[PDB]
Paper text:
To understand the molecular basis for heterodimerization between ESCPE-1 protomers and its membrane tubulation activity, we determined the crystal structure of SNX1BAR–SNX5BAR (where BAR stands for the BAR domains of both proteins) at 2.5 Å resolution. The structure forms an antiparallel dimer of three-helix bundles with a curvature that would fit a circle with a diameter of ~32 nm. Electron density at the tip of SNX5BAR is very weak, indicating flexibility of this region. Unlike other SNX-BAR homodimers, the SNX1BAR–SNX5BAR heterodimer exhibits asymmetry on its surface properties, general shape, and the associated PX domains located at either side of the BAR heterodimer. The interface buries a large area of 5,114 Å2, of which 78% corresponds to polar surface. From this analysis, we found that two clusters formed by F347 and W511 in SNX1, and F273 and F401 in SNX5, have the highest binding energy. Yet, only F347 and W511 in SNX1 are conserved, indicating that these residues likely form a binding hot spot. SNX1BAR and SNX5BAR exhibit complementary polarity at their distal and proximal interfaces. Consistent with previous predictions, the central region of SNX5BAR has a negative patch, whereas the equivalent region in SNX1BAR is neutral. The crystal structure of the SNX1BAR–SNX5BAR complex presented here, together with analytical modeling, revealed that SNX1 comprises a hydrophobic binding hot spot compatible with homodimerization and heterodimerization, whereas SNX5 uses distinct patches of polar residues to preclude homodimerization and enhance heterodimerization.
A key component of the recycling machinery is the endosomal sorting complex for promoting exit 1 (ESCPE-1), which rescues transmembrane proteins from the endolysosomal pathway for transport to the trans-Golgi network and the plasma membrane. The SNX protein family is defined by the presence of a phox-homology (PX) domain that typically binds phosphatidylinositol phospholipids (PtdInsPs), but may also participate in protein–protein interactions. Twelve out of the 33 annotated mammalian SNXs contain an additional carboxy-terminal Bin/Amphiphysin/Rvs (BAR) domain, and are therefore denoted as the PX-BAR or SNX-BAR subfamily. Herein, we show that ESCPE-1 has a single-layer coat organization and suggest how synergistic interactions between ESCPE-1 protomers, phosphoinositides and cargo molecules result in a global arrangement of amphipathic helices to drive tubule formation.
Residue numbers in the entry:
A (entry chain A): 305 to 522
B (entry chain C): 206 to 326, 342 to 404
Protein backbone atom coordinates (compact mmCIF):
# COMPACT_ATOMS: atom_id res chain seq x y z
CA UNK A 1 0.00 0.00 0.00
CA UNK A 2 1.03 3.61 -0.68
CA UNK A 3 0.15 6.22 1.95
CA UNK A 4 1.35 9.12 -0.22
CA UNK A 5 -1.96 9.40 -2.08
CA UNK A 6 -4.11 9.16 1.04
CA UNK A 7 -1.86 11.75 2.68
CA UNK A 8 -1.48 14.12 -0.28
CA UNK A 9 -5.25 14.12 -0.77
CA UNK A 10 -5.57 15.53 2.75
CA UNK A 11 -3.08 18.34 2.13
CA UNK A 12 -4.95 19.24 -1.06
CA UNK A 13 -8.41 19.18 0.52
CA UNK A 14 -7.07 21.28 3.41
CA UNK A 15 -5.44 23.90 1.19
CA UNK A 16 -8.70 24.30 -0.74
CA UNK A 17 -10.40 25.07 2.58
CA UNK A 18 -7.90 27.83 3.38
CA UNK A 19 -8.41 29.21 -0.14
CA UNK A 20 -12.20 29.41 0.16
CA UNK A 21 -11.75 31.09 3.55
CA UNK A 22 -9.46 33.83 2.23
CA UNK A 23 -11.59 34.07 -0.92
CA UNK A 24 -14.84 34.62 0.99
CA UNK A 25 -13.10 37.25 3.12
CA UNK A 26 -11.97 39.03 -0.05
CA UNK A 27 -15.49 38.95 -1.49
CA UNK A 28 -16.73 40.82 1.58
CA UNK A 29 -13.82 43.23 1.16
CA UNK A 30 -14.82 43.92 -2.45
CA UNK A 31 -18.43 44.58 -1.45
CA UNK A 32 -17.39 46.68 1.55
CA UNK A 33 -15.17 48.76 -0.73
CA UNK A 34 -18.02 49.06 -3.23
CA UNK A 35 -20.29 50.03 -0.34
CA UNK A 36 -17.73 52.65 0.70
CA UNK A 37 -17.44 54.16 -2.79
CA UNK A 38 -21.22 54.56 -2.80
CA UNK A 39 -21.31 56.33 0.57
CA UNK A 40 -18.45 58.52 -0.64
CA UNK A 41 -20.47 59.44 -3.73
CA UNK A 42 -23.42 60.43 -1.53
CA UNK A 43 -21.17 62.51 0.74
CA UNK A 44 -19.57 64.28 -2.23
CA UNK A 45 -23.02 65.32 -3.46
CA UNK A 46 -24.08 66.58 -0.02
CA UNK A 47 -20.90 68.66 0.15
CA UNK A 48 -21.60 70.44 -3.13
CA UNK A 49 -25.16 71.14 -1.98
CA UNK A 50 -23.77 72.50 1.29
CA UNK A 51 -21.39 74.78 -0.61
CA UNK A 52 -24.33 76.11 -2.62
CA UNK A 53 -26.44 76.62 0.51
CA UNK A 54 -23.51 78.54 2.00
CA UNK A 55 -23.66 82.33 2.05
CA UNK A 56 -19.88 82.76 2.45
CA UNK A 57 -18.33 82.80 -1.01
CA UNK A 58 -14.98 81.50 0.26
CA UNK A 59 -16.63 78.57 2.07
CA UNK A 60 -18.81 77.76 -0.94
CA UNK A 61 -15.67 77.76 -3.08
CA UNK A 62 -13.73 75.52 -0.69
CA UNK A 63 -16.73 73.25 -0.06
CA UNK A 64 -17.41 72.94 -3.79
CA UNK A 65 -13.73 72.12 -4.34
CA UNK A 66 -13.76 69.54 -1.54
CA UNK A 67 -16.72 67.80 -3.17
CA UNK A 68 -14.70 67.50 -6.38
CA UNK A 69 -11.93 65.80 -4.40
CA UNK A 70 -14.41 63.36 -2.88
CA UNK A 71 -15.84 62.82 -6.36
CA UNK A 72 -12.42 61.66 -7.57
CA UNK A 73 -11.88 59.50 -4.48
CA UNK A 74 -15.14 57.58 -4.86
CA UNK A 75 -14.00 56.58 -8.36
CA UNK A 76 -10.68 55.32 -7.01
CA UNK A 77 -12.65 53.34 -4.42
CA UNK A 78 -14.78 51.68 -7.10
CA UNK A 79 -11.85 50.92 -9.41
CA UNK A 80 -9.92 49.66 -6.38
CA UNK A 81 -12.83 47.37 -5.50
CA UNK A 82 -12.99 46.24 -9.13
CA UNK A 83 -9.24 45.64 -9.00
CA UNK A 84 -9.64 43.78 -5.70
CA UNK A 85 -12.31 41.48 -7.08
CA UNK A 86 -10.79 40.81 -10.50
CA UNK A 87 -7.07 40.76 -9.70
CA UNK A 88 -7.16 39.37 -6.15
CA UNK A 89 -10.53 37.59 -5.98
CA UNK A 90 -10.35 35.93 -9.40
CA UNK A 91 -6.77 34.92 -8.59
CA UNK A 92 -8.14 32.78 -5.75
CA UNK A 93 -11.06 31.25 -7.66
CA UNK A 94 -8.68 30.02 -10.37
CA UNK A 95 -6.49 28.12 -7.91
CA UNK A 96 -9.61 26.69 -6.25
CA UNK A 97 -10.56 25.64 -9.78
CA UNK A 98 -7.19 23.92 -10.26
CA UNK A 99 -7.30 22.26 -6.83
CA UNK A 100 -10.65 20.71 -7.76
CA UNK A 101 -8.93 19.40 -10.90
CA UNK A 102 -6.44 17.44 -8.78
CA UNK A 103 -9.30 16.27 -6.56
CA UNK A 104 -11.07 14.88 -9.62
CA UNK A 105 -7.79 13.15 -10.49
CA UNK A 106 -7.76 11.42 -7.11
CA UNK A 107 -11.43 10.59 -7.63
CA UNK A 108 -10.71 9.25 -11.12
CA UNK A 109 -7.89 7.14 -9.67
CA UNK A 110 -10.35 5.54 -7.24
CA UNK A 111 -12.74 4.93 -10.14
CA UNK A 112 -10.16 3.11 -12.26
CA UNK A 113 -9.09 1.26 -9.12
CA UNK A 114 -12.71 0.34 -8.38
CA UNK A 115 -13.29 -0.91 -11.93
CA UNK A 116 -10.00 -2.80 -11.66
CA UNK A 117 -11.23 -4.38 -8.43
CA UNK A 118 -14.61 -5.08 -10.04
CA UNK A 119 -12.80 -6.89 -12.86
CA UNK A 120 -10.96 -9.03 -10.31
CA UNK A 121 -14.32 -10.09 -8.88
CA UNK A 122 -15.53 -10.95 -12.39
CA UNK A 123 -12.53 -13.22 -12.95
CA UNK A 124 -13.13 -15.36 -9.86
CA UNK A 125 -16.63 -16.23 -11.07
CA UNK A 126 -15.03 -17.43 -14.31
CA UNK A 127 -12.53 -19.71 -12.58
CA UNK A 128 -15.29 -21.04 -10.33
CA UNK A 129 -17.47 -21.69 -13.38
CA UNK A 130 -14.70 -23.93 -14.74
CA UNK A 131 -14.17 -25.77 -11.45
CA UNK A 132 -17.82 -26.83 -11.50
CA UNK A 133 -17.53 -28.00 -15.12
CA UNK A 134 -14.38 -30.04 -14.42
CA UNK A 135 -16.60 -32.72 -12.88
CA UNK A 136 -19.30 -32.53 -15.57
CA UNK A 137 -19.28 -34.51 -18.81
CA UNK A 138 -19.20 -31.70 -21.40
CA UNK A 139 -15.78 -30.80 -22.81
CA UNK A 140 -17.31 -28.16 -25.09
CA UNK A 141 -18.71 -26.02 -22.26
CA UNK A 142 -15.44 -26.55 -20.38
CA UNK A 143 -13.36 -24.93 -23.12
CA UNK A 144 -15.95 -22.13 -23.12
CA UNK A 145 -15.11 -21.49 -19.46
CA UNK A 146 -11.35 -21.82 -19.96
CA UNK A 147 -11.59 -19.21 -22.73
CA UNK A 148 -13.52 -16.62 -20.70
CA UNK A 149 -10.89 -17.03 -17.97
CA UNK A 150 -8.13 -16.33 -20.49
CA UNK A 151 -9.99 -13.26 -21.78
CA UNK A 152 -10.67 -11.83 -18.32
CA UNK A 153 -7.12 -12.71 -17.29
CA UNK A 154 -6.01 -10.04 -19.77
CA UNK A 155 -8.85 -7.67 -18.86
CA UNK A 156 -7.80 -7.38 -15.22
CA UNK A 157 -4.28 -7.01 -16.60
CA UNK A 158 -5.49 -3.99 -18.57
CA UNK A 159 -7.35 -2.39 -15.66
CA UNK A 160 -4.31 -3.01 -13.46
CA UNK A 161 -2.06 -1.27 -15.99
CA UNK A 162 -4.56 1.60 -16.25
CA UNK A 163 -4.49 2.10 -12.47
CA UNK A 164 -0.70 2.31 -12.62
CA UNK A 165 -0.80 4.98 -15.33
CA UNK A 166 -3.65 6.91 -13.70
CA UNK A 167 -1.72 6.89 -10.42
CA UNK A 168 1.20 8.39 -12.35
CA UNK A 169 -0.93 11.15 -13.89
CA UNK A 170 -2.11 12.34 -10.47
CA UNK A 171 1.55 12.47 -9.44
CA UNK A 172 2.40 14.36 -12.64
CA UNK A 173 -0.57 16.69 -12.08
CA UNK A 174 0.31 17.55 -8.47
CA UNK A 175 3.88 18.44 -9.44
CA UNK A 176 2.55 20.55 -12.31
CA UNK A 177 0.23 22.44 -9.95
CA UNK A 178 3.08 23.12 -7.50
CA UNK A 179 5.67 24.23 -10.07
CA UNK A 180 3.13 26.48 -11.80
CA UNK A 181 2.31 28.11 -8.45
CA UNK A 182 5.79 29.32 -7.50
CA UNK A 183 6.41 30.44 -11.09
CA UNK A 184 3.44 32.82 -11.41
CA UNK A 185 2.34 33.51 -7.83
CA UNK A 186 4.90 36.23 -7.11
CA UNK A 187 4.04 38.22 -10.24
CA UNK A 188 0.28 37.97 -9.71
CA UNK A 189 0.75 39.32 -6.18
CA UNK A 190 2.89 42.24 -7.36
CA UNK A 191 0.27 43.03 -10.00
CA UNK A 192 -2.40 43.58 -7.35
CA UNK A 193 -0.07 45.30 -4.87
CA UNK A 194 0.68 47.83 -7.60
CA UNK A 195 -3.06 48.47 -7.93
CA UNK A 196 -3.12 49.57 -4.28
CA UNK A 197 0.07 51.62 -4.66
CA UNK A 198 -1.47 53.53 -7.57
CA UNK A 199 -4.57 54.32 -5.51
CA UNK A 200 -2.52 55.67 -2.60
CA UNK A 201 -0.43 57.77 -4.99
CA UNK A 202 -3.66 59.21 -6.40
CA UNK A 203 -5.05 59.93 -2.93
CA UNK A 204 -1.97 61.94 -1.95
CA UNK A 205 -1.99 64.04 -5.13
CA UNK A 206 -5.71 64.67 -4.60
CA UNK A 207 -5.18 66.10 -1.11
CA UNK A 208 -1.90 67.85 -1.91
CA UNK A 209 -3.84 69.83 -4.52
CA UNK A 210 -6.70 70.65 -2.15
CA UNK A 211 -4.43 71.72 0.73
CA UNK A 212 -3.52 75.05 -0.95
CA UNK A 213 -7.22 75.63 -1.62
CA UNK A 214 -8.01 75.11 2.07
CA UNK A 215 -5.31 77.54 3.22
CA UNK A 216 -6.62 80.08 0.68
CA UNK A 217 -9.86 80.40 2.69
CA UNK A 218 -10.08 84.00 3.90
CA UNK B 1 -33.36 95.60 9.32
CA UNK B 2 -33.47 92.84 6.69
CA UNK B 3 -30.32 91.24 8.16
CA UNK B 4 -32.34 89.20 10.66
CA UNK B 5 -34.80 88.29 7.89
CA UNK B 6 -32.31 86.80 5.43
CA UNK B 7 -30.46 85.32 8.41
CA UNK B 8 -33.61 83.41 9.38
CA UNK B 9 -33.91 81.78 5.96
CA UNK B 10 -30.20 80.97 5.76
CA UNK B 11 -30.04 79.24 9.15
CA UNK B 12 -33.16 77.16 8.46
CA UNK B 13 -31.86 75.99 5.08
CA UNK B 14 -28.24 75.54 6.18
CA UNK B 15 -29.27 73.34 9.12
CA UNK B 16 -30.81 70.76 6.77
CA UNK B 17 -27.71 70.94 4.57
CA UNK B 18 -25.51 70.55 7.65
CA UNK B 19 -27.54 67.66 9.08
CA UNK B 20 -27.59 65.88 5.71
CA UNK B 21 -23.83 66.17 5.20
CA UNK B 22 -23.37 65.01 8.80
CA UNK B 23 -25.12 61.65 8.42
CA UNK B 24 -23.47 61.17 5.02
CA UNK B 25 -20.02 61.76 6.52
CA UNK B 26 -20.78 59.30 9.32
CA UNK B 27 -21.87 56.57 6.90
CA UNK B 28 -18.73 57.10 4.82
CA UNK B 29 -16.41 56.88 7.84
CA UNK B 30 -18.23 53.82 9.18
CA UNK B 31 -17.80 52.16 5.78
CA UNK B 32 -14.09 52.95 6.08
CA UNK B 33 -13.72 51.00 9.33
CA UNK B 34 -15.57 48.12 7.66
CA UNK B 35 -12.91 47.90 4.95
CA UNK B 36 -10.32 48.24 7.72
CA UNK B 37 -11.82 45.20 9.45
CA UNK B 38 -11.50 43.09 6.29
CA UNK B 39 -7.82 44.08 6.16
CA UNK B 40 -7.03 42.32 9.43
CA UNK B 41 -9.43 39.50 8.55
CA UNK B 42 -7.58 39.07 5.26
CA UNK B 43 -4.12 39.16 6.84
CA UNK B 44 -5.30 36.38 9.17
CA UNK B 45 -6.39 34.08 6.34
CA UNK B 46 -3.14 34.91 4.53
CA UNK B 47 -1.06 34.08 7.60
CA UNK B 48 -3.05 30.90 8.24
CA UNK B 49 -2.80 29.92 4.57
CA UNK B 50 0.98 30.42 4.39
CA UNK B 51 1.57 27.78 7.09
CA UNK B 52 1.33 24.52 5.12
CA UNK B 53 3.03 25.35 1.82
CA UNK B 54 6.44 25.09 0.09
CA UNK B 55 9.07 27.27 1.72
CA UNK B 56 9.79 29.19 -1.51
CA UNK B 57 6.42 30.95 -1.53
CA UNK B 58 5.60 30.50 2.19
CA UNK B 59 7.84 33.46 3.03
CA UNK B 60 6.13 35.52 0.32
CA UNK B 61 2.70 35.08 1.92
CA UNK B 62 3.99 36.10 5.35
CA UNK B 63 5.18 39.38 3.83
CA UNK B 64 1.77 40.31 2.41
CA UNK B 65 -0.12 39.20 5.52
CA UNK B 66 2.27 41.38 7.54
CA UNK B 67 1.55 44.20 5.08
CA UNK B 68 -2.23 43.92 5.50
CA UNK B 69 -1.83 43.90 9.29
CA UNK B 70 -0.21 47.33 8.97
CA UNK B 71 -2.56 48.67 6.28
CA UNK B 72 -5.50 47.89 8.56
CA UNK B 73 -3.85 50.19 11.11
CA UNK B 74 -3.77 53.14 8.69
CA UNK B 75 -7.33 52.56 7.49
CA UNK B 76 -8.64 52.59 11.05
CA UNK B 77 -6.63 55.76 11.65
CA UNK B 78 -7.96 57.63 8.61
CA UNK B 79 -11.51 56.70 9.64
CA UNK B 80 -10.93 58.12 13.12
CA UNK B 81 -9.37 61.37 11.91
CA UNK B 82 -12.15 61.56 9.31
CA UNK B 83 -14.77 61.40 12.07
CA UNK B 84 -12.93 64.01 14.15
CA UNK B 85 -12.25 66.61 11.46
CA UNK B 86 -15.34 66.26 9.23
CA UNK B 87 -18.20 64.47 11.00
CA UNK B 88 -17.43 66.20 14.30
CA UNK B 89 -17.16 69.60 12.60
CA UNK B 90 -20.54 69.15 10.93
CA UNK B 91 -21.87 67.92 14.27
CA UNK B 92 -20.63 70.97 16.18
CA UNK B 93 -22.20 73.51 13.82
CA UNK B 94 -25.42 71.52 13.44
CA UNK B 95 -26.01 72.37 17.11
CA UNK B 96 -24.40 75.81 16.76
CA UNK B 97 -27.00 76.67 14.11
CA UNK B 98 -29.76 75.60 16.50
CA UNK B 99 -28.31 78.03 19.05
CA UNK B 100 -28.23 80.96 16.62
CA UNK B 101 -31.79 80.00 15.68
CA UNK B 102 -32.87 80.37 19.31
CA UNK B 103 -31.25 83.82 19.40
CA UNK B 104 -33.34 85.01 16.45
CA UNK B 105 -36.46 83.49 18.04
CA UNK B 106 -35.92 85.45 21.26
CA UNK B 107 -35.15 88.70 19.43
CA UNK B 108 -38.41 88.58 17.48
CA UNK B 109 -40.22 87.86 20.76
CA UNK B 110 -38.82 91.00 22.38
CA UNK B 111 -39.71 92.79 19.14
CA UNK B 112 -43.43 92.06 19.48
CA UNK B 113 -43.16 93.25 23.09
CA UNK B 114 -41.88 96.61 21.85
CA UNK B 115 -44.38 96.43 18.99
CA UNK B 116 -47.21 96.31 21.54
CA UNK B 117 -45.93 99.28 23.55
CA UNK B 118 -45.30 100.98 20.19
CA UNK B 119 -49.07 100.96 19.55
CA UNK B 120 -50.09 102.42 22.93
CA UNK B 121 -47.82 105.31 23.90
CA UNK B 122 -45.79 104.40 29.85
CA UNK B 123 -43.45 101.40 29.59
CA UNK B 124 -41.34 102.02 26.49
CA UNK B 125 -38.77 99.64 28.01
CA UNK B 126 -39.89 97.12 25.38
CA UNK B 127 -38.13 99.40 22.89
CA UNK B 128 -34.92 99.61 24.93
CA UNK B 129 -35.12 95.87 25.61
CA UNK B 130 -35.70 95.15 21.91
CA UNK B 131 -32.60 97.13 20.96
CA UNK B 132 -30.54 95.57 23.75
CA UNK B 133 -31.29 92.20 22.13
CA UNK B 134 -31.25 93.23 18.45
CA UNK B 135 -27.76 94.67 18.98
CA UNK B 136 -26.34 91.72 20.91
CA UNK B 137 -28.08 89.32 18.52
CA UNK B 138 -26.48 90.82 15.41
CA UNK B 139 -23.21 91.08 17.35
CA UNK B 140 -23.31 87.36 18.18
CA UNK B 141 -24.58 86.16 14.80
CA UNK B 142 -21.73 88.00 13.07
CA UNK B 143 -19.41 86.53 15.70
CA UNK B 144 -20.74 83.10 14.74
CA UNK B 145 -20.05 83.57 11.03
CA UNK B 146 -16.45 84.60 11.74
CA UNK B 147 -15.92 81.60 14.02
CA UNK B 148 -17.46 79.21 11.47
CA UNK B 149 -15.14 80.34 8.67
CA UNK B 150 -12.06 79.80 10.84
CA UNK B 151 -13.25 76.39 12.03
CA UNK B 152 -13.90 75.15 8.49
CA UNK B 153 -10.54 76.42 7.23
CA UNK B 154 -8.79 75.00 10.31
CA UNK B 155 -10.28 71.52 9.94
CA UNK B 156 -10.05 71.47 6.13
CA UNK B 157 -6.32 72.20 6.40
CA UNK B 158 -5.67 69.64 9.14
CA UNK B 159 -7.66 66.93 7.35
CA UNK B 160 -5.72 67.53 4.14
CA UNK B 161 -2.45 67.15 6.07
CA UNK B 162 -3.61 63.93 7.75
CA UNK B 163 -4.88 62.51 4.45
CA UNK B 164 -1.49 63.25 2.89
CA UNK B 165 0.24 61.71 5.92
CA UNK B 166 -1.56 58.36 5.69
CA UNK B 167 -1.44 58.35 1.88
CA UNK B 168 2.35 58.68 1.88
CA UNK B 169 2.55 56.09 4.66
CA UNK B 170 0.64 53.48 2.65
CA UNK B 171 2.66 54.34 -0.46
CA UNK B 172 5.93 53.63 1.35
CA UNK B 173 4.47 50.48 2.93
CA UNK B 174 3.28 49.11 -0.41
CA UNK B 175 6.36 50.42 -2.24
CA UNK B 176 8.78 48.53 0.00
CA UNK B 177 6.73 45.34 -0.41
CA UNK B 178 6.60 45.55 -4.21
CA UNK B 179 10.27 46.49 -4.50
CA UNK B 180 11.00 43.56 -2.18
CA UNK B 181 9.26 41.01 -4.40
CA UNK B 182 10.58 42.53 -7.64
CA UNK B 183 14.05 42.04 -6.13
CA UNK B 184 13.52 38.65 -4.51
Amino acid sequence: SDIWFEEKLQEVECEEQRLRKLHAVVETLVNHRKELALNTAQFAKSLAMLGSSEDNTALSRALSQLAEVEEKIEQLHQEQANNDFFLLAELLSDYIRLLAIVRAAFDQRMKTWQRWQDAQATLQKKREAEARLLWANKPDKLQQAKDEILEWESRVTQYERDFERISTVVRKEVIRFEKEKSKDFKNHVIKYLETLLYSQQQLAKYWEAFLPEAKAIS
Amino acid sequence: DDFFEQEKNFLINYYNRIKDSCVKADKMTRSHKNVADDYIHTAACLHSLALEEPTVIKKYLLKVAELFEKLRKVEGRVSSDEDLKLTELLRYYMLNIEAAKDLLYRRTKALIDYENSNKALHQQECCQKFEQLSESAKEELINFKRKRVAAFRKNLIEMSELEIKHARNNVSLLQSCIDLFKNN
